[PDB]
From a paper:
Spo11 is a central hub making extensive protein–protein and protein–DNA contacts.
We also solved the structure of the core complex bound to a double-hairpin substrate with a single-stranded DNA (ssDNA) gap at 3.3-Å resolution. The preference for binding to bent DNA14 motivated these experiments, on the premise that the ssDNA region would provide the flexibility needed to assemble dimeric complexes that resemble the pre-DSB state. Weak density in the unsharpened map spanned the single-stranded nucleotides T38-T37-A36 and a portion of the second hairpin, with the two duplex segments aligned at a relative angle of 130°. Moreover, the contacts of R131 and Q144 with the 5′-phosphate at the beginning of the duplex and of E233 with the 3′-hydroxyl explain the strong selectivity for a free 3′-OH end and 5′ ssDNA overhang.
Author numbering:
A (entry chain F): 9 to 58
B (entry chain A): 2 to 31, 40 to 76, 86 to 188, 198 to 222, 228 to 246, 251 to 330, 335 to 398
C (entry chain C): 7 to 75, 79 to 100, 106 to 133, 138 to 158, 168 to 265, 268 to 278, 286 to 394
D (entry chain B): 2 to 12, 28 to 40, 45 to 52, 57 to 66, 74 to 258
DNA sequence: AGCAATGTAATCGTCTAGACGATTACATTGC
């Protein structure tokens, strides 16, 4: 099987988000990315540099 | 695996309570040896087979002293509280429930101290055993004192110049004349026979009177009196009041002595068995400053000696109004006097003939 | 020398005050017993006891305030649980309890109390821990109000009992303590000018401070303490020692603690109230005894008004004195009202006896 | 030879792997446990990455209660030799091995499997290419090695990568033998109770955020913190 | 040493989701 995301479950349910100082589990920088869009993006990145 | 727990249940609540392991909440309750034996065996067997075959997380639930606590086995409370070492209370409960099994059929009572010393590395304290005994005693509608063959350890000690004779239909024990021994143990039925009362504390002044001994009997529970000493005093009074006379507690001037004396004198509104002869002729602060006209005896009050002295002023004067006439008038006035004077006396160093009439 | 108000209260009188109209005196049995100052020729003050129940815990301190320049008079009193209980005594007599403090602040046990007259009326009161608050009166349609303006924290750690206090004219809040260290502050600065201590350089003991009184001018400062079995008074001129008033035999002024003392109107005499029962009058120049007022319970043959036996059975032929006060000229009424200056006293046998010499 | 390889969650594109040495109601137990973190990136980059990897000793020693031994690099990897502090060989024997052979009958005991290797294959794709930026990968070393713990490694292996479950086990393992010794005058129920403690779901991180939350400061989860 | 009380710490209800605050809990005084 595959893992979810720590924030996907954290955002599907209604958590008041103030657990950043307590649980430290809220990192806003990046989220779950679909495999197809990520693959096409990295392919484009490699193709640009050549 | 979340594939089946996240995409099918879609609620913040209604999930932490539904997808919770099936707990078999078991009640401790369901006046004879066979009845309690059978009920405790049923508890033990129903817990054991549930753990073994069905694999059921047990949830022990019981009642506590009325002014509810549930001891779940795999600490399955979804709230990791810092104060959560709850399996050391459950393993003492289930261990005492085994000693009860091992001691009931023999019909010979065993003290709390022996039970503690059998498994000291587990119970870790003789107070814990008593605390958990006074819970399974209540949850079984049994008297805390007349109970499932577990007895106190005879703290209180009595000096008497005449052989008193207890009579318990457990057969009779016998306190002997002139031998500072412990008060004999007996159940709540004995007809005490004689063949005056001066109660003390700390065992130090008591030992001094035993050494001196210049017909006065010297009952003395060592700190704050135990149940055995209070039962001894009560039954002694109610069976030989026409012999004995002038019961007198003797404590020092600290706002602790005034509580040790209060233990003999009167308990709360639920005060079943207390010695009612407690004419508290204690060593007051106006009795030391009068003999101080023959390391100072007078010690200034700290923040514990006083905080507890003004707590017997707020407590005593709660329902009764008239201070002019009351059995606690003497206690209240002496309690206010220490707070005003800021200095408490002692009885260890000021021993004299005041204890006797002459 | 004046009509003794024997058997005033029935538990224990603990203080007294004077208001040129009133002679308010708290006691242990909950209620004040204000006595009208002006009699006519012989009327006993017993029928003038205008009692009013205040708090059932008890009372230890009391102080009054008279402003005549329309005739607002107040009476403050602290209880044995710790509470300011201002009572605006109007005029027959009505005891309207006043509430000038919020319940939020009322969390600590106030102990001492003393009023400060306006030259801006001020009142201060020490806590049991050692804190010393300083209020300020704004009576000014009618709403008396007590407003805080400072608090001189006890520098010591751990803190002591904080027995006494003063609000001297020019401003020096001599907060006495349970072992020397008489804190000295300023009424308009709240910055401790000095921090005194017990000049005794003997072994470590508990020499408490019972009273701290100033001079009407504002120069002298009487200090009354005890060497744990005697009474001594040492002046702290504004600690800086001027001398130790005592009597020849050692270094003691009384055979027991000097419980209270007060200055005079001209500041030329220092009356003393000792547990030894005498009232030895000192002087600020000669430092010698003037007169002795021994007390005994044989003034009246009839036993119904005099008290000679305590609650337990001992003989109070040697009554202690908890508080005495001085009355200005034209305060008391009777013979020698203007040519003589009167003083009142409070004894152990619960008998307020106003006094007059020559 | 059953093996489990978690699917590649594209947070950058990386993977995982749990190697087990068992015979095929189960109880998973740490070996005696090496956590491999080979990057497989097609400079000082390896030095700083090893620094971040070794910056998690505070986590492994204050949350999961482990004991690091080596941070050795076998020519490609940043492996961490981890020895369990709670599930020591003495406890591993005492709790389960003795009744598993002493009480030989149709008991129903859980068959204990094992696990040694956790080979992660985090493969970053930097936007600028070969060059990287420091402190930019903390919310990439913290949103994978926390998501994997939250999702499955606390459910299907609650004894080796579970914070609160291991905390409860080390809290209540002292009174685990005398609670059955007083229940059946034996030690038969030790493996069943140890399996039930792992099977408990009310001690995973999923059911711990969603509560009344009486105590804030626990489960820091900010692993691989930059020095 | 068998019983007890003080002090504060932690959690549990209400009332403004956290807080505070007004309540019980058990550790550390004590005789
Ligand atoms: Mg004592």
């Amino acid at each position: 099987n595959k893992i979810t995301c720590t924030q996907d479950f954290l955002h599907q349910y209604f958590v008041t988000e103030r657990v950043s100082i307590q649980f430290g589990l809220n990192n806003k920088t990046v989220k779950r990315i679909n495999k197809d869009e990520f693959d096409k993006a990295v392919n484009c990145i490699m193709s640009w540099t050549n | 695996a979340l594939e089946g727990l996240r995409k099918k249940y879609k609620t913040r609540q209604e999930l932490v309570k539904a997808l919770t392991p099936k707990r078999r909440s078991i009640h401790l309750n369901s006046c004879s040896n066979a009845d309690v034996l059978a009920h405790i065996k049923h508890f033990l067997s129903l817990a054991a087979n549930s753990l073994e075959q069905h694999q059921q997380p047990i949830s022990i639930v019981f009642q506590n002293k009325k002014k509810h606590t549930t001891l779940d086995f795999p600490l399955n409370g979804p709230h990791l509280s810092t104060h959560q070492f709850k399996l050391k209370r459950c393993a003492i409960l289930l261990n005492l429930l085994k000693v009860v099994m091992e001691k009931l059929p023999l019909g010979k009572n065993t003290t709390v101290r022996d039970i503690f010393y059998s498994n000291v590395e587990l119970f870790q304290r003789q107070a814990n055993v008593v605390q958990w005994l006074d819970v399974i005693r209540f949850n079984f509608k049994l008297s805390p004192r007349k109970s499932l063959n577990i007895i106190p350890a005879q703290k209180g000690l009595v000096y008497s110049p005449f052989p008193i004779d207890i009579y318990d239909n457990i057969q009779k024990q016998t306190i002997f004349s002139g031998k500072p021994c412990l008060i004999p143990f007996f159940q709540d039925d004995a007809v005490i026979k004689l063949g005056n009362i001066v109660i003390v504390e700390k065992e130090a002044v008591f030992t001094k009177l035993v050494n001196n001994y210049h017909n006065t009997m010297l009952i003395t529970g060592k700190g704050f009196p135990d149940f055995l000493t209070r039962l001894f005093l009560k039954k002694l009074e109610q069976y030989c009041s026409n012999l004995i006379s002038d019961c007198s507690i003797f404590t020092d001037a600290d706002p602790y002595g005034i509580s040790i004396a209060l233990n003999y004198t009167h308990s709360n509104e639920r005060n079943a068995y207390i010695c009612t002869m407690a004419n508290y002729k204690g060593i007051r602060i106006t009795q030391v400053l009068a003999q101080n006209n023959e390391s100072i005896q007078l010690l200034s009050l700290n923040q514990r000696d006083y905080s507890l002295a003004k707590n017997l002023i707020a407590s005593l004067t709660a329902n009764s109004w008239d201070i002019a006439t009351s059995p606690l008038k003497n206690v209240v006035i002496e309690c206010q006097r220490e707070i005003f004077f800021q200095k408490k006396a002692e009885m260890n160093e000021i021993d004299a003939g005041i204890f006797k009439y002459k | 020398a004046t009509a003794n108000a024997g058997k005033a209260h029935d538990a224990d009188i603990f203080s007294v005050s004077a208001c040129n109209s009133f002679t308010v005196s708290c006691s242990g049995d909950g209620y004040l017993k204000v006595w009208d100052n002006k009699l006519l020729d012989n009327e006993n003050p017993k029928d003038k006891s205008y009692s009013h129940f205040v708090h059932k815990s008890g009372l230890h301190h009391v102080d009054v305030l008279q402003t005549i320049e329309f005739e607002l008079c107040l009476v403050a009193t602290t209880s044995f649980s710790g509470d300011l209980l201002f009572y605006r005594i109007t005029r027959k007599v009505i005891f309207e309890k006043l509430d000038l403090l919020d319940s939020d602040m009322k969390k600590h046990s106030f102990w001492a109390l003393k009023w400060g007259a306006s030259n801006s009326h001020r009142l201060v009161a020490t806590d049991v821990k050692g804190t010393t608050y300083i209020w300020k009166f704004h009576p000014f349609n009618w709403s008396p109000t007590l407003e805080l303006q400072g608090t001189v924290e006890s520098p010591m750690t751990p803190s002591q009992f904080a027995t006494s206090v003063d609000i001297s004219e020019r401003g020096l809040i001599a907060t006495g303590f349970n072992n020397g260290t008489v804190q000295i502050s300023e009424l308009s600065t709240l910055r401790p000018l000095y921090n005194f201590e017990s000049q005794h350089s003997m072994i470590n003991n508990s020499n408490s401070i019972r009273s701290v009184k100033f001079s009407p001018q504002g120069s002298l400062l009487a200090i009354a303490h005890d060497s744990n079995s005697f009474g001594c008074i040492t002046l702290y001129e504004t600690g800086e020692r001027i001398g130790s008033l005592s009597v020849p035999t050692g270094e003691f002024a009384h055979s027991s603690w000097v419980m209270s003392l007060s200055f005079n109107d001209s500041g030329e005499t220092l009356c003393s109230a000792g547990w030894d029962g005498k009232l030895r009058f000192w002087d600020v120049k000669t430092k010698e005894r003037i007169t002795t007022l021994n007390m005994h319970c044989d003034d009246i043959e009839i036993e119904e008004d005099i008290l000679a036996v305590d609650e337990h059975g001992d003989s109070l032929a040697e009554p202690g004195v908890f508080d005495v006060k001085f009355l200005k000229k034209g305060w008391r009424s009777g013979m020698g009202a203007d040519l003589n200056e009167s003083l009142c006293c409070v004894c152990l046998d619960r008998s307020i006896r106003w006094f007059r010499e020559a | 030879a059953r093996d489990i390889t978690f699917l590649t969650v594209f947070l950058s594109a990386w993977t995982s792997t749990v190697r087990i040495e068992g015979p095929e109601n189960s109880l998973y137990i740490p070996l005696l446990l090496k956590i491999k973190l080979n990057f497989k990136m097609n400079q000082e980059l390896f030095t700083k990455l090893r620094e971040i990897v070794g910056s998690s000793i505070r986590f492994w020693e204050e949350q999961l209660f482990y004991q690091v031994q080596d941070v050795s690099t076998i020519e490609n990897h940043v492996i961490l030799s981890l020895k369990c502090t709670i599930l020591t060989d003495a406890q591993i024997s005492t709790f389960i091995s003795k009744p598993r052979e002493l009480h030989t009958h149709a008991k129903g005991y859980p068959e204990i499997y094992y696990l040694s290797e956790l080979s992660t294959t985090v493969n970053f794709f930097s936007k600028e290419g070969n060059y990287v930026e420091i402190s930019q990968v903390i919310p990439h070393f913290n949103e994978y090695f926390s998501s994997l713990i939250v999702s499955q490694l606390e459910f299907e292996y609650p004894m080796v990568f579970s914070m609160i479950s291991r905390l409860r086990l080390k809290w209540q393992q002292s009174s685990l033998a005398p609670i059955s010794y007083a229940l059946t005058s034996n030690s038969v129920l030790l493996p069943i109770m140890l399996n039930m403690i792992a099977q408990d779901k009310s001690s995973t991180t999923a059911y711990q955020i969603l509560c009344r939350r009486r105590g804030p400061p626990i489960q820091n989860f900010q692993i691989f913190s930059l020095p």
